[PDB]
Design a protein around this ligand. Structure first.
Ligand code: ADP
Ligand code: ADP
Ligand code: ADP
Ligand code: ADP
Lengths: 353, 361, 352, 128
């Protein structure tokens, strides 16, 4: 048998993101998005209770037994910090434990093109980093924020659920607010953010109509606003913001977006061709004079054609062009690149070319 | 006058399985009774009293389950007997005494073809993300279809499946996935509470049960929008009727967001019903299948929900779609259902009449 | 002593309810009408002692807190009764109903032979309707008891309260009383499908949620019995349809057309002898024409179908039942005309 | 402040609801302080402000200016506006129209012959 400390050590050593402990299965660790069972006997109810309780204080145990649910974060000296969730299934304890990295990675390490570096220099605008869950959005935002913290003498405020990467003060003052502990909600944090003299604000996901307008106000009133969406492309991102409003407001919102939008990044993590690790495929839309006019005229669909031809001038890049490069460098397999292309026949034409 | 040598609960359930029974009954003033081929037959035992039924039923409850049963006088649960079988138990109260009913739960989950599900349902189980809705009235095969879908995912993927059920019906032992199943009223306090913590539990596939209220619908859309495969049920009878229920439960001012979200995340709508079989034994599945294509996704954003039915009529060949009448037509050519049942259940009897008279079949 | 002697009078004269209130002698309900006993009137002292003489100590403290109290109690050698005690004009008053225990047979109840066939249906919805005290529970108790004798199936009843008691015969019979065995009609039906039933009695179709349960039970392969307070078959079907919002009446009409197997609308009318009551019942048994009429929303046309499906299917309109009681001279013309839903047609039907 | 001449004429309106709206930090309180100061300078009336918190202070000039801070001077907007009609006011500043309760109170003040000033976070007249 192995205890909780040995299991967490193996999760870190193998570069995994998540450790799962549940009954009738061995401990499993998520490596590169897919689960892998550890070389251990299947757990029983005693094991899951013993392993999960081994990292809890007495009050955390008593709170867990009152609700059969528990969110927490904890540290193991000399290893890493982890965020754990404990719950109950089939009458037995179960647990999931997520890694919180100590180290912020650089732009080049993450495979982010240099145009993302320039967005950290934007004085006032809205920059959106979008993608499905676990597509690298938070790491890219943390990479941009750390460069601003390093390079500017301004005030950075983040509202996060939860706070992942920690930003010690460099040249900036960095305040990080965790929803549910430091602040009641995004709505509450955003209710007072304009009285907090911010320069750059990270608001998390544009969850509802009220948060879209709040992010638009910051970027339009002279601030640099960072936000995320769960869209898969630059065009789909712009459409989702506009389409949630009633049609007769929509004209105003397109005009505000055209002025404040300074960059849209859409990420996805694909399994590498070597069989270890994941590689970043990203679509980058940086508004040029042509695209900002297309936004105001509700000619959003001509943007894709403009992104296809504005790469050398503005550092723009369609998703298919990014997949193309990962195919040329043999970073991804042929099936993986096809499986994510929004238009596989277009990418096929590029490949035969 | 007989005492001190009563059959054990373990022994009663062991005899239930060995004799091929479907259900074990424990109630006062009756001996244990077993259902064989649909009919109850008493075992050659003395009749049970209230002490017997409570002691037998309590022998298979955890201490937390006894307290939950005593608070509501109702209790559904599942348990395993090592080396024998799994069981669904229901404990209730009648005439002031404990009563219990215990159903046999087979080890083998039925396949798509055994259930009469078209091959398009198979492909919905391969979706990497999105929302899949399985609809129909109570007992129209919704849970069984979902059990078949999750089981293929359990077999094929190395991902995390979490289900929230009230109660847990079909049980999913681990295959290639890690499967966590939370039972409302025992494992978790409520649907609302389980969904509040699910995103911190690293899920890939989630079963959320019925889209009961506005809170749950918003939770399922978030799961489906954030890159997850989310399974849910409604009690609507058609793909078009299903979409109308989702949008219309929301205030009018946020229907635009709901309509936009559905067009992106919706990957399939299955509307089932069980009709009495033509053979005279059992019921057979008639299912309407809507798989959103770019054309259907546009009608959702443009508030043209009504026009989707015309698209399903002509999406059978290309998209594997199937209107309810198109399924009833196929069941009639196969002589699986009678004519009165086919016409009497058709949502549009005029279309089905036209479909049969083609002379081209 | 005094109250125990009073309740024996109630049983011996065959009454249904005993009334105790100030400025009146004790009154007992016989055949639907109150009859005063040849006794002195009760004062406030009398009603208090009589009602309190049958109360437990916990019940005494409970009644004075609310001026209301529900209870049931037994009198050794007589019967059990359900009582309600309350306060009026500053004094205690009480009403006591008899809980019948002996189930009468189908023929003793005046039920036609077609009702006997209903207890042999394997699945569907059967509705027994009528005002309060129109004979629904005896009819239901007779039906349930025959199933218990003839079948090896599972009978579950949910009652508020339990009236007739059904010991196990060939069936397993579980009886759940609301407020003791189960919290509510809604809670019992939440678990009923997981209790492996074959025949279920759900009581009154009082709201939308219970109707969905009865229709679900009936189309999922069970025989479900339920009650309404309507006085005819058409009236009964309309009440089920009109409870729902307009946009789902097509689904409910479709459900009803398949699962409905019988509608019994009863009323107890005084016999021409002047002592006792005879049952008048409208029976609607769906034939292919009627089932189509329900789904096609031609519900008003159903009454015409019942008048001519009589010989073949055992059907009987209320007027046809009233004709027979008039032809056999069991009830008076005033009683028969008073219950006829269309007295002029009965007149045409009576004289040919 | 760059305010057009119509803003000064609004400060001379005898009655009604005048709304100065915009996002936070768009100059709403500064414009209101200039209006109230002009009213305070030119009129012999009673000004009551309900602010959360009090920003600009208005010492008495020709008007009587009472400024109530919520949480210290008064328990809430809801409680302060419940008694504002009993305080013989001519001009009332109620702050932001944050909920249904204050909006109906501000509409009642402006309906009963007072000049009421309030704010919203809207960006245009129609949107307001
Ligand atoms: N550019 C990247 N390249 C490779 N891996 C990345 C990259 N960005 C993030 N990751 C890794 O993906 C996993 C999830 O990252 P995260 O940013 O938290 O996802 P999300 O943005 O959807 O919340 C982590 O293990 C992280 O190290
Ligand atoms: N596709 C199907 N075809 C035939 N029978 C089915 C099918 N699905 C389920 N059944 C059977 O019908 C019954 C009801 O199905 P179930 O999904 O459990 O109820 P519900 O969908 O109303 O919640 C089950 O006992 C099952 O054996
Ligand atoms: N078919 C019947 N014929 C003669 N008497 C009946 C008949 N049905 C019921 N009764 C008597 O009338 C009384 C009312 O019956 P009950 O079923 O308890 O009321 P309800 O139908 O309103 O629930 C019973 O006590 C019963 O003895
Ligand atoms: N009409 C104006 N013209 C120029 N600057 C102004 C004007 N109004 C306010 N300001 C300046 O803008 C800043 C914000 O003013 P403030 O009243 O506090 O915000 P708000 O109107 O949203 O309450 C102040 O520092 C002020 O100096």
């Amino acid at each position: 048998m192995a205890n909780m400390h040995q299991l967490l050590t193996e999760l870190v050593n193998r570069g995994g993101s998540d450790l799962h402990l549940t009954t009738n299965s061995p401990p499993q660790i998520r490596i590169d998005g897919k689960l892998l069972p550890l070389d251990m006997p299947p757990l029983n109810a005693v094991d899951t209770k013993q392993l999960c309780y081994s990292i809890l204080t007495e009050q955390q145990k008593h709170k867990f037994e009152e609700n059969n649910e528990l969110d927490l974060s904890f540290g193991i000296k000399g290893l890493s910090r982890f965020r754990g969730n404990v719950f109950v299934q089939r009458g037995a304890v179960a647990g999931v434990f997520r890694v919180i990295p100590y180290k912020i990675l650089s732009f080049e390490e993450l495979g982010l093109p240099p145009v993302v570096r320039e967005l950290a220099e934007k004085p006032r605008g809205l920059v959106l980093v979008t993608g499905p869950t676990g597509s690298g959005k938070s790491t890219t935002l943390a990479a941009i924020i750390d460069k601003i913290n390093t390079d500017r003498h301004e005030h950075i405020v983040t509202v996060e659920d939860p706070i992942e990467y920690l930003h010690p003060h460099k040249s900036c003052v960095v305040n990080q607010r965790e929803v549910g502990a430091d602040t009641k909600s995004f709505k509450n944090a955003l209710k007072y953010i304009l009285r907090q003299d911010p320069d750059v604000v990270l608001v998390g996901e544009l969850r509802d109509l009220e948060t879209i307008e709040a992010a638009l106000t910051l970027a339009e009133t002279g601030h640099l606003c960072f936000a995320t969406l769960h869209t898969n492309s630059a065009v789909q991102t712009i459409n989702r913001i506009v389409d949630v409003f009633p049609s007769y407001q929509q004209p105003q919102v397109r005009a505000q977006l055209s002025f404040v939008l300074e960059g849209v990044l859409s990420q996805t993590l694909l399994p590498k061709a070597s069989g270890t690790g994941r590689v970043l495929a990203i679509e980058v839309m940086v508004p040029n004079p042509a695209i900002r006019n297309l936004i105001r005229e509700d000619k959003i669909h001509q943007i894709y054609s403009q992104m296809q031809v504005g790469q050398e001038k503005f550092g723009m890049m369609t998703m298919n062009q990014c997949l193309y490069g990962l195919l040329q460098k043999r970073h991804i397999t042929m099936d993986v690149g096809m499986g994510r292309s929004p238009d596989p026949d277009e990418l096929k034409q590029m490949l035969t070319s």
